[PDB]
Design a protein around this ligand. Structure first.
Ligand code: ADP
Ligand code: A1BKZ
Ligand code: MG
Length: 857
């Protein structure tokens, strides 16, 4: 157990709290008659009910479908479709006529398996409202089909009547495919091709254009409707991305009401009968090309071929008699929960002895096991520049480094790709003869009850291993090396659990309400495979708690704002609260930074003197974050090269800071348009060492945003979670003790970003908060016996009943103000003296000094 923490609160402040509560006429819960029966201090403190179909209209010559606005300037404002159609045709005919590098690219395009199905695909699309283009990965579904459709309208003098939307499940795919199709038309993105992912877009031209966006972005732009679009291409439907599954529900209603629209669903070689039945038994256009017979090998075959020996229910124990005693004895020593890196090294050295030039595609879960495998290889001098080109391929690296996987290598060098499941069905790498398959997947499991994020390394499906096996037989007779026992393969599920089954639904719930599609549960019931009940109940509960929905489950003015903001609704509300306190910029910066990896280059180690200094004396990763932005935004003043020098010298990832800043500008814009004043979102300079009340309030609002992630510090890295369970301070934290010197925290309480479950519970991105900040924002339920208070039945404080119930009343007073503010956001300019008195009182108890703490000593 742990003793109740004493909160040394001054007599002056305890009166001020009581005064404000009295001035606001707040119904404070009085003390208990006796101990043993404690009282809850929590103060509990609508629109008419409505199904609806998202409206549709075809392309128009004086309309820009991407900016969702009229063209009332330039030549295209008055110009007729016939002129635009001829102007765009003549331009393309002349380009193909001249550019010899473009002619060569078109000659590569015309060799892709999909090419010979061009006639049938175009014929199918023209006849039917919806079709499915099923076909193996590498035929050219993604890159060619949109072009075929566009060219067919250009060549047949109807370029003005074509505007294609193409949805991709991943961010990287939307941007990469746009860059790829642009190159294939001898352009950069911004002409015939463009992309619109989250916090980054390059808009294409208003006519005869393709938009490669993510589904999340499309849904956020449907508020007006699908106006000025001829075709909607939903790509990679087989991956079962939750937002894609959701869009198919929307699009089916759209097809039914507006059958003139054209929907093209594109899928790998899977059972597409589910989607066919869903879209009124639509046609399935089959696409195929040359494939070679790939030899399948499992963990037994690999260990035996390489004569491998590991260092110092389990399916590695189960092994057939048709194998060797040492093979069976060797395999048995391998832990299934880890990937054998030394075996992959042994498999690469075996691939050499076969004397058949070809690239090796190594499938791994995430950026960690790719980083680990890469580091492991470069240690051995054999896997050097002269003999091996080892290229990593995951989401969070520059596109320059990702483009290099397609580049040919000089003969004598082997191209080894250490990739995630991006290279499973989403992209095809050429000259791939060998595939080393870990047989694992990285999925984000989230259990709401304990607020546990688990980036788990779970088993892949049979369908996954069959698709990964097929990545070898596109050049010549290939080999696939599965690192799973022949027993384990039998125990694998046929298909991966679709995201709809195992993902929070509150972001989708808001989308449903914004687009006015009716009831959350009513709409999600129409899904191709509806989500489980508790996930819909959990979503409806989450949005009610935030006052995003009311008792009638109808969207509130607050809920409308949260829907438009593309971040966690809890961070969206934290930003709204931030605006009220005139710290809107800082909270927008913090909110943005959650969407990107850490700007620090720590390399999975403890932080150095340089990175730790950004934290100041606040014992906060979030203060460190805000501080690198202050330092970075100051360094940018001296041009681009000075920015690159600052980043290199301070070991910072420049691409991360730029994308995060860009995101902050876009979040800020959505608040401005929602009615919030300009001068409550200004970049206010701050100190991370000296007294700063604006930073005090940011950390108070942080506590709200990351709730229910709070923890208690015991000794060294060992911390106590909200479940009363043991957890660790993450190595990458500033609050992680460097070497043996134990940190003297002025408070044991920490709010934090993610509650990562691995071997043990690891709290990442930690910020120290006072016990007053704990009671104000980082708690829901509070019970008092008169002397002790019980915060969410996990930790106890020794604080005056009066102060604890008053701090609990401010929380309710703030919620009430947030509701009033969201009805008319411009009221934060001039507030009632009474409202500013409770804001000033929150500002007061946000201070360290308020809890008798001086961070400078
Ligand atoms: N960035 C790229 N660099 C080189 N080749 C590429 C690139 N993107 C796609 N390709 C090639 O284009 C062809 C079609 O790919 P794609 O349209 O993604 O196929 P799919 O039908 O599987 O979606 C493949 O041969 C692939 O190797
Ligand atoms: C609604 S639709 O489905 O018919 N068309 C559609 C589809 C997908 C995406 C977008 N639009 C965008 O992605 C973006 C637009 C702007 C923008 C807007 C105004 C001024 C300046 C920039 C930035 S991103 C439209
Ligand atoms: Mg594809």
């Amino acid at each position: 157990t742990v003793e109740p923490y004493k909160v040394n609160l001054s007599q002056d402040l305890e009166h001020q709290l009581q005064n404000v509560i009295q001035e606001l006429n707040l119904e404070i819960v009085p003390p208990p008659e006796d101990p043993f029966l404690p009282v809850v201090l929590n103060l509990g403190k609508p629109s008419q009910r409505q199904i609806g179909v998202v409206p549709w209209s075809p392309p128009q010559s004086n309309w820009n479908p991407w900016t969702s606005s009229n063209i009332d300037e330039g030549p295209l404002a008055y110009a007729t479709p016939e002129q635009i159609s001829m102007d765009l045709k003549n331009e393309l005919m002349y380009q193909l006529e001249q550019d010899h590098d473009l002619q060569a690219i078109l000659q590569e395009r015309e060799l892709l398996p999909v090419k010979k199905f061009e006639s049938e695909i175009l014929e199918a699309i023209s006849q039917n409202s919806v079709i499915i283009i099923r076909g193996a990965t590498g035929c050219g579904k993604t890159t060619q089909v949109p072009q075929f459709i566009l060219d067919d309208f250009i060549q047949n003098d109807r370029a003005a009547e074509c505007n294609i939307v193409v949805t991709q499940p991943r961010r990287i795919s939307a941007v990469s495919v746009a860059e790829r199709v642009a190159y294939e038309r001898g352009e950069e993105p911004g002409k015939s091709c463009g992309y619109s992912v989250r916090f980054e877009s390059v808009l294409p031209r208003p006519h005869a254009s393709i938009m490669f966006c993510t589904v999340g972005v499309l849904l956020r732009k449907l508020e007006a409707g699908i106006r000025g679009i001829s075709h909607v291409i939903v790509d990679e439907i087989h991956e079962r991305d939750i937002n894609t599954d959701f869009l198919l529900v929307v699009l089916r209603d759209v097809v039914q009401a507006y059958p003139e629209v054209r929907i093209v669903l594109m899928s790998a070689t899977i059972d597409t009968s589910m989607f066919c039945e869903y879209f009124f038994n639509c046609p399935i256009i089959e696409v195929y090309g040359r494939t070679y017979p790939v030899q399948e090998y499992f963990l037994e075959d690999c260990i035996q071929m390489t004569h491998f020996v590991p260092p110092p229910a389990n399916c590695n124990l189960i092994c057939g008699d048709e194998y060797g005693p040492e093979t069976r004895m060797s395999m048995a020593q391998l832990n299934e929960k880890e990937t054998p890196f030394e075996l992959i090294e042994a498999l690469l050295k075996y691939i050499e002895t076969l004397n058949v030039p070809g690239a090796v595609l190594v499938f791994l879960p995430g950026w960690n096991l790719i980083y680990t495998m890469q580091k492991h290889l470069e240690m051995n001098p054999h896997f050097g520049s002269h003999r091996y080109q080892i290229l990593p391929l995951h989401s969070q690296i520059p596109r320059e480094e990702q483009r290099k996987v397609f580049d040919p290598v000089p003969s004598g060098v082997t191209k080894v790709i250490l990739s995630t499941n991006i290279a499973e069905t989403s992209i095809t790498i050429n000259d791939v003869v060998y595939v080393i398959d870990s047989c694992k997947q990285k999925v984000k499991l989230f259990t709401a009850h304990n607020n546990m994020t688990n980036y788990a390394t779970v088993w892949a499906s049979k369908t996954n291993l069959e698709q990964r096996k097929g990545r070898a037989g596109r050049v010549r007779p290939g080999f696939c090396f599965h690192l799973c026992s022949r027993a384990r393969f039998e125990r694998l599920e046929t298909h991966m659990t679709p995201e709809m089954f195992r993902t929070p639904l509150h972001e989708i719930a808001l989308s449903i309400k914004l687009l006015r599609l009716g009831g959350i549960g009513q709409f999600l019931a129409k899904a191709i495979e509806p989500p489980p009940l508790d996930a819909v109940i959990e979503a409806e509960h989450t949005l009610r708690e935030l006052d995003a929905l009311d008792a009638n489950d109808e969207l509130t003015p607050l809920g409308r704002i949260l829907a438009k903001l593309p971040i966690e609704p809890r961070f969206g509300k934290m930003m709204i609260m931030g605006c009220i306190f005139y710290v809107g910029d800082a909270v927008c910066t913090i909110s943005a930074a959650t969407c990107f990896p850490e700007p620090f280059i720590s390399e999975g180690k403890r932080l150095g003197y340089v990175h730790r200094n950004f934290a100041g004396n606040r014992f906060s990763d979030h203060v460190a974050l805000l501080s690198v932005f202050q330092a970075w935004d100051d360094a940018r003043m001296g041009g681009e090269e000075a920015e690159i020098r600052f980043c290199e010298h301070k070991r910072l990832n420049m691409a991360t800071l730029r994308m995060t800043w860009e995101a902050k500008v876009q979040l800020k814009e959505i608040l401005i348009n929602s009615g919030f004043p300009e001068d409550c979102l200004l970049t206010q300079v701050f100190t991370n060492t000296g007294p700063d009340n604006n930073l005090d309030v940011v950390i108070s609002l942080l506590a709200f945003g990351v709730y229910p992630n709070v923890c208690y510090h015991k000794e060294k890295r060992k911390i106590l979670t909200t479940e009363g369970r043991n957890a660790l301070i993450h190595k990458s934290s500033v609050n992680c003790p460097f070497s043996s010197q134990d940190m003297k925290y002025p408070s044991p309480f920490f709010v934090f970003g993610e509650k990562i479950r691995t071997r043990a519970i690891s709290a990442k991105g930690m910020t120290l908060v006072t016990p007053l900040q704990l009671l104000l924002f980082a708690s829901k339920k509070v019970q008092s016996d008169g002397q002790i208070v019980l915060v969410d039945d996990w930790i106890r404080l020794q604080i005056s009943h009066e102060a604890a119930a008053c701090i609990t009343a401010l929380r309710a007073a703030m919620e009430a103000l947030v509701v009033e503010v969201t009805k008319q956001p411009n009221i934060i300019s001039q507030l009632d003296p009474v409202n500013e008195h409770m804001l000033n009182m929150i500002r007061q108890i946000s201070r360290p000094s308020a809890a008798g703490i001086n961070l400078m000593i």
